[PDB]
Design a protein around this ligand. Structure first.
Ligand SMILES: [Mg+2]
Ligand SMILES: [Mg+2]
Ligand SMILES: [Zn+2]
Ligand SMILES: [Zn+2]
Lengths: 67, 98, 55, 170
RNA sequence: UUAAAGGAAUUGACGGAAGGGCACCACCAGGAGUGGAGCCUGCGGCUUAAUUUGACCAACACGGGAAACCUCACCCGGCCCGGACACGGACAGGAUUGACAGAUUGAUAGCUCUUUCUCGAUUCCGUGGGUGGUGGUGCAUGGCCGUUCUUAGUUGGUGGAGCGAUUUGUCUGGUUAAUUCCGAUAACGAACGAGACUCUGGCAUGCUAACUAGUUACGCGACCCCCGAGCGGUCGGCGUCCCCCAACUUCUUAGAGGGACAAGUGGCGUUCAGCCACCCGAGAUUGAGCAAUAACAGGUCUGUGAUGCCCUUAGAUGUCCGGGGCUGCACGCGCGCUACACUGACUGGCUCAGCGUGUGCCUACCCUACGCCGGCAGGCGCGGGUAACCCGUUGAACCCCAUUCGUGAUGGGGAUCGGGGAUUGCAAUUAUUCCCCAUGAACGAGGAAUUCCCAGUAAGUGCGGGUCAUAAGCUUGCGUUGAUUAAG
């Protein structure tokens, strides 16, 4: 009837309200900033992650070497 | 429930091609036997027809361990719009056998 | 949730996986001849199956 | 594929019979149900309902047979074109016990005096050509404690085998 | 100071009140016991984080409750939403799913956290409202079930008696397992229960019928035989509906019909109901099922999408996962199992069954022949069987025959406990079960008391269904051997 240890909350997401994953110079130029996933489905589609060093494909859970 | 939009059209197209659908009261079944082609658990088959009751569209009775459902005519005119069908397509409810 | 271990304890052999085909209890059920009904209300439908008592 | 033993053949179609009896009870109770009767062939199987009000099981051009064929077909493992339903009127409405058990169900749901409702049905079976009948209505009547009022009329046997076919209970 | 105290009758219940009947859940006469011992299992108590709980003749091997986990309620922790709908908000310039790595955990639970990709109106937030619950309440109920209750009991209609409640019918007697009948009679005519009835068991050398049952005969093969034959003997070896290279139903399995009625004969009895003897005959009462009227504050909401009301509903009594518990032990009680030996235990020979059950829609896994590995449980290869087709002529135990042992807590008894070996399983620890070797405890027939039973019965003795992945000291059935006492 107490619950002292406080199960803290649920998961509320980070809510980052900006895309801007395509920087542009010289008045119009396609330029990636994140790697694409090397899977059989989403070549230059749904991005691969850019961490402080590593890459990670979020949709199908494949990951590139930590380098 | 969580409502994947491919699988709601998958259960509505079966619930509109005939005026029945025959889920069984067990939640831990990964494969509805009559659908059987979009690896649907019948969690969704329950919890879609729950909502179809509460809008007044579907009409339930419960067997030994089975859910049987029927179309009320308000549900039929709802499904001709959400499946985006012309007002000539009707189920096997009205007259396809003689 | 997280479907890997929702229903992961193996319902296989054992009385946590047998159940009544009418009435959905796991206790007392008769798995003889593939009946798989509850003990308490096999007696209801025993004439509907066709099992007469002695007369 | 391979077929199963004769001992569990006979309990499987007996439990087929008991299952759709219970569902067609739950559906057609308000419509005068009074049972079913099954015939299996190596073709289309034919199940005749024994409804007393055969008008109400028929929809506008017979809907509530055709969806009631479909739930029988899409549950009990029949292909498209193997089970059919027919509605048939059972003779002497007030002589089979299931029928007016259900009739006085919806008369007591109608809010009658329980003594008024049971007398109308007691008078009805005994004028329908019966040798004896009795109705027991038991539970929470006017009072906080439950009690049982029975309304026996005529003669009625209780023991032996002839209380298996000379009677029907409900 | 008080709403009754009282009177006469009636119906029930009761009587350490009479009279007449009945019951092995009563006794006699007996048997087997139980009660003492060890063990198995339920209950109480104690203990415990929890040792979940319901029930106290008619609770206590009972919830078909033999729990490793699941079951599962209870305990310690942790995810999930499987919170439908209705309204508003959030809401394309950023509502919501999912997730690699790592401190983060019991956990490869994105549980949370750090970082960052991904999902396409699906949702999320708030408020009403559902919904679920092995949550309460069986004294709010239904249904089922047990019980007074295995005994003969119960009720109208119409007449009669009473102002009336009621009573007669429904009885002096005789008789019956029975208000069963006879008869008597202010009653008459009835109905339910009893009985009949259904299942079962025993008999029909009669009928119908059998390559999924058989017999007999006839062929063939084998083997024995004074001496050496064979219409000799043995053979569950083969064949004879395989397209006649035979007939038949005794045995086996059914189906029909028959048969027993107290019929026949004495004796008793009102020559009534009936009873007691015999003869004939398979049988002169087979065994069980259903089972009334009226009830119980009987049990069950923890069997049920039977259900009222209350409670709880997201830090949820919902549900899932992991661990633990329901098995903890100074003790008390109840069912039972094995024993205390020589009417026995060994070791080996030898011969007899019946009831039944078997591969699954979800559901994974069934019964087992044979062959070959193993000292044993077992392991493989190889078949058959959805069954009068295969296991299976179910070579069951007891018993029978020989051997050893000799009245010694002994080769009786096998508890306890060490070490090893296999199988089931996701997992065997608090030993699942089985196997082997060793250890070798009480126990010498059981006080008061108490149970069940009178014929294939008691008791002995195994077998099979239920539970069952692994499993019966339980239960429900089956056969086997078979009585001692009694007809009150
Ligand atoms: Mg229940
Ligand atoms: Mg001795
Ligand atoms: Zn891809
Ligand atoms: Zn409560």
């Amino acid at each position: 009837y107490t619950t002292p240890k406080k199960n803290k909350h649920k998961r509320k997401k980070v809510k980052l309200a900006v895309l801007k994953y395509y920087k542009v110079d010289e008045n119009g130029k396609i330029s990636r900033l994140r790697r694409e996933c090397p899977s059989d489905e989403c070549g230059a589609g749904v991005f691969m992650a850019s961490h402080f060093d590593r890459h990670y494909c979020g949709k199908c859970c494949l990951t590139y070497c930590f380098n | 429930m969580l409502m994947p939009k491919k699988n709601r059209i998958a259960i509505y197209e079966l619930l509109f091609k005939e005026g029945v659908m025959v889920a069984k009261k067990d939640v831990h079944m990964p494969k509805h036997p009559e659908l059987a082609d979009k690896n649907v658990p019948n969690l969704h088959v329950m919890k879609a027809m729950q909502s179809l009751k509460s809008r007044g569209y579907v009409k339930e009775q419960f067997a030994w361990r089975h859910f049987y459902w029927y179309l009320t005519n308000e549900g039929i005119q709802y499904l001709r719009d959400y499946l985006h069908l012309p007002p000539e397509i009707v189920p096997a409810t009205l007259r396809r056998s003689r | 949730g997280h479907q890997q271990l929702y229903w992961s304890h193996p319902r296989k052999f054992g009385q946590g996986s047998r159940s009544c085909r009418v009435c959905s209890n796991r206790h007392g059920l008769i798995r003889k001849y593939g009946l798989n009904m509850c003990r308490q209300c096999f007696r209801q439908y025993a004439k509907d199956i066709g099992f007469i008592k002695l007369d | 594929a391979v077929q199963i033993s004769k001992k569990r053949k006979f309990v499987a179609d007996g439990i087929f019979k008991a299952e759709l009896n219970e569902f067609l009870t739950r559906e057609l109770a308000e419509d005068g149900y009074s049972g079913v009767e099954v015939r299996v062939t190596p073709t289309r199987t034919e199940i005749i309902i024994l409804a007393t009000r055969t008008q109400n099981v028929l929809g506008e051009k017979g809907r509530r047979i055709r969806e009631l064929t479909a739930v029988v077909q899409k549950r009990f493992g029949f292909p498209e074109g193997s089970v059919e339903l027919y509605a048939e009127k059972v003779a002497t409405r007030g002589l089979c016990a299931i029928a007016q058990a259900e009739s006085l169900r919806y008369k007591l749901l109608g809010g009658l005096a329980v003594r008024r409702a049971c007398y109308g049905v007691l008078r009805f079976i005994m004028e329908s050509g019966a040798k004896g009948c009795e109705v027991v209505v038991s539970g929470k009547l006017r009072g906080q404690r439950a009690k049982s009022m029975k309304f026996v009329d005529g003669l009625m046997i209780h023991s032996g085998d002839p209380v298996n076919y000379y009677v029907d209970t409900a």
